[PDB]
Amino acid sequence: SLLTEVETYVLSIIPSGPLKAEIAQRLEDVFAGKNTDLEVLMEWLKTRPILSPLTKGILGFVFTLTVPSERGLQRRRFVQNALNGNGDPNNMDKAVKLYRKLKREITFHGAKEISLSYSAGALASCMGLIYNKMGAVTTEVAFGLVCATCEQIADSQHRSHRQMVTTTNPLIRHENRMVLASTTAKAMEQMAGSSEQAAEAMEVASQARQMVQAMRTIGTHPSSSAGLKNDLLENLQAYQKRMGVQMQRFK
Amino acid sequence: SLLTEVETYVLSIIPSGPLKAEIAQRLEDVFAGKNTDLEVLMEWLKTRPILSPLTKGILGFVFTLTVPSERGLQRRRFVQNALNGNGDPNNMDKAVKLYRKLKREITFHGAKEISLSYSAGALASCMGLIYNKMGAVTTEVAFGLVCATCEQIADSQHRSHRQMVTTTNPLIRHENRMVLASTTAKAMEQMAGSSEQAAEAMEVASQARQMVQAMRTIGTHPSSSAGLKNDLLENLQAYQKRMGVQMQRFK
Amino acid sequence: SLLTEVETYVLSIIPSGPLKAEIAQRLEDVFAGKNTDLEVLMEWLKTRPILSPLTKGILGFVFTLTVPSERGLQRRRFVQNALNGNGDPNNMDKAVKLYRKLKREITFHGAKEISLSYSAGALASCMGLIYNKMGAVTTEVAFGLVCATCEQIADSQHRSHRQMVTTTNPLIRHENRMVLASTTAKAMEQMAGSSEQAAEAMEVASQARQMVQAMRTIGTHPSSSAGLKNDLLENLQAYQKRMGVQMQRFK
Amino acid sequence: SLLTEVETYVLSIIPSGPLKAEIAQRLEDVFAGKNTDLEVLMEWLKTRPILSPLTKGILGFVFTLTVPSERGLQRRRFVQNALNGNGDPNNMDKAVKLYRKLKREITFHGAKEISLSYSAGALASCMGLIYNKMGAVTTEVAFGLVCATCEQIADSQHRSHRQMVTTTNPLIRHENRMVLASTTAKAMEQMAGSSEQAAEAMEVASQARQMVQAMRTIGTHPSSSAGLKNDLLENLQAYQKRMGVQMQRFK
Numbered sequence A, B, C, D: 001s002l003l004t005e006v007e008t009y010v011l012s013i014i015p016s017g018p019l020k021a022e023i024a025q026r027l028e029d030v031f032a033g034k035n036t037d038l039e040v041l042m043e044w045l046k047t048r049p050i051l052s053p054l055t056k057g058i059l060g061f062v063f064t065l066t067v068p069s070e071r072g073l074q075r076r077r078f079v080q081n082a083l084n085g086n087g088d089p090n091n092m093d094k095a096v097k098l099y100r101k102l103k104r105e106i107t108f109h110g111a112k113e114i115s116l117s118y119s120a121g122a123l124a125s126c127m128g129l130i131y132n133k134m135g136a137v138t139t140e141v142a143f144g145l146v147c148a149t150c151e152q153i154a155d156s157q158h159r160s161h162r163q164m165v166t167t168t169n170p171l172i173r174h175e176n177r178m179v180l181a182s183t184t185a186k187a188m189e190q191m192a193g194s195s196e197q198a199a200e201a202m203e204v205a206s207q208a209r210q211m212v213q214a215m216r217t218i219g220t221h222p223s224s225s226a227g228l229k230n231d232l233l234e235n236l237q238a239y240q241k242r243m244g245v246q247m248q249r250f251k
Helices: A002-013 A018-030 A038-047 A053-066 A077-083 A089-103 A108-115 A120-132 A139-165 A170-190 A197-218 A228-250 B002-013 B018-030 B038-047 B053-066 B077-083 B089-103 B108-115 B120-132 B139-165 B170-190 B197-218 B228-250 C002-013 C018-030 C038-047 C053-066 C077-083 C089-103 C108-115 C120-132 C139-165 C170-190 C197-218 C228-250 D002-013 D018-030 D038-047 D053-066 D077-083 D089-103 D108-115 D120-132 D139-165 D170-190 D197-218 D228-250
Strands: none
Touching (some): A002 A018, A002 A139, A002 B139, A002 B170, A018 A053, A018 B170, A018 B197, A038 A053, A053 A120, A053 A139, A077 A120, A089 A139, A108 A139, A108 B139, A120 A139, A139 A170, A139 B053, A139 B170, A170 A197, A170 A228, A197 A228, A228 B228, A228 C228, B002 B018, B002 B053, B002 B139, B018 B053, B038 B053, B053 B077, B053 B120, B053 B139, B077 B120, B089 B108, B089 B139, B139 B170, B170 B197, B170 B228, B197 B228, B228 C228, B228 D228, C002 C018, C002 C053, C002 C139, C018 C053, C038 C053, C053 C077, C053 C120, C053 C139, C077 C120, C089 C108, C089 C120, C108 C139, C120 C139, C139 C170, C139 D002, C170 C228, C170 D002, C170 D018, C170 D139, C197 C228, C197 D018, C228 D228, D002 D018, D002 D139, D018 D053, D038 D053, D053 D077, D053 D120, D053 D139, D077 D120, D089 D108, D089 D120, D089 D139, D108 D139, D120 D139, D139 D170, D197 D228
């Protein structure tokens, strides 16, 4: 069940969207013996616009571990660029210290357990060593290094959400609502359901998007109005809930 | 009953799937005097895509112990690559220290009992020595070395599950559910029952797979919605239980 | 604003349904100078099947207070039957004691404030005296007597809900869910929306109604199954929430 | 919402089965203005074979309260026979004591709250007085008397289950399993699903019924065997769970 456990950590860091569905479907193919040619897979991976270079690096890295027949594959540049760890010497010293301990393990958990003791920076650098063949560790350990990195990123992915919503600055909190509404509105428009709900869903989605932009145009500063900041948010709250129920309707 | 005891440990580490059924059926043939030609067996073993190189190594290793007429067999490369223990000198020193003690035993249990006192890394390296003929120990001891390795991996296989499900990070926990549902959905589709339940089972399986991917597309981040994260998991929980009962229906 | 305050209390006791909308619309007509002929109004009131005789009595009583030109109206039998207070002598003694104090007031609040000090039984009897012309109090006081009765009933209407849901007997609690689901399912079917949602709403409503009756047929006793009582409620909970969101969709 | 609250209590006491679905559907018709002729309704009620005379009495009683136009209805004999309270003088004295207090209330909850302070015997007798017109209370109170009786029966319906399953006598506990299995098996056979599962469900149901009767034929006394009592129950436990999952399959 290692292939399932790694798939949890890897897919956690990827942002939600059509790519996440496409990436996960790709992971199943290469985790189920349906391995397509690596080059066309990675070439498709490279062109993806939304993924961050670091996140794009891990997905490229994980594919290489599955495909057999080394010495005939190709080490993609963007993976090396992403995983290089900024070329820092100080953190890369920790990476070697990690890689010393990883070489002695063969169990996936043993790699993950020791890896999480080190900073998120070192794992990216150390994970570069395995990809570049500078080091060499068994496949089970290498995933244990990926999950330690993916868990570290995934932890900060969640910790950022907790800090952003509980922020005390009112200005961004208002700004958080409009962009959040726009993103939720964007979610329906891009996913056009087969049923007639797509037309209705697009309308309500376009309604919020057409209205949120007007809300930004008026603004919500205390000095930009005389109490209009209050009622402006209220319509958004209704619109957010209006879009909230709309999601499960086509479900 | 040694052949049964080793078959327990060896088959424990292999991930569940069609290969596990095929591998175990192969083990019965070579553990019951139905030994097919080793080369065609190992050649089939090499091409298997899902098995990790280390796990693939042990299965290749165990077959060699059964087949008689050394000096006329062939030492497969992938076994040596997997069992080399990353070429570390430090852990391989422990392997020799182990191999010193294994040479003096002949009992299977005696090999297993002493072997488990050493790290999982050393056993992989020491188990390489027996395969490469660098060392030489009686067959009963050698299985005692395999089971010590297989037990060590099997222990970490279970310990990883305990740590993954009890993880405190909510983001992966949600991600754990979708991939878990996809895997369970994948289980029915690949195993097409002879009865008409295959069509119905495929439909409900495709229903979850068609719906889990939509769930990923919407996402479940706290900042990607306004409470939709709650009800999105609930339908999965019903779907998981819906697929849960469906398994024993064709049983 | 007396006509609004009385309309609150009167409409509170009436159960929700198409009649409540029809009754309230009627109250507006007779509270806004659009007074239709009393006889045709009360004749329509008499034929209503769902209203309890006591609740039907108050609505008949309130209309008589608005219409002018006494001695030419008609005292309907069902109002007298409902408001007679079971012909008890003991509670009717309290009613006279109340009616002694009401005669001295002219303010609506003064009537309501003193009236609530007496049991709900007496108010029904005392409210009979005003309708039958046995007594005679100014119109503002008489509404003050109605609201005291309507408030008393409305208080027990709510207090019953609190006691029913927090009941400790598991058997009725399970039974509460099925009937509650059936009522909610019945709500959509009777109110056929003009949009196409009526067809879809009817389907999901008929789904719960078609499934709740099957749930009753199987039953949910601990001795009628071996754990099926658990999962049977779960589908209802999903169905209840499924119908819950469906309500605001046509809104 | 009184009509819903009474429907909870009334339907709780009725045993599960096709009749319970039919009765509840009838209650909706007479609680929603679809009141069919009382006589044909009660005549159908009388012929029902499974309902106990007391339980059959309450359902007959509740219908009479809804239908208007007294003096032209008919007081059915079986209702009087069931509700007579065995003609005891002692408990009927309590019933009058209750009926003294009920006459002064008009609120449904007020009737229910005071009614539950009295023994279940008195309520049956007192509930007879209202039906026979010996007494006279408002409709809201009368339901408050029914629910007090229905709650009292429903409480003992549940309390019997708790005492039966936790019984220490092993002989009935074994006997409880066979009859419980037969009842569960009977549930599927009578409810023939429209899908093909009816044929399969009937087979497994007939399997348990065909096997439970054989189990009774062998018996399960300690002196009727030499350890066969153990394994005989085990197959039932599998059969019970086998039928347990089968229920939600056609759901």
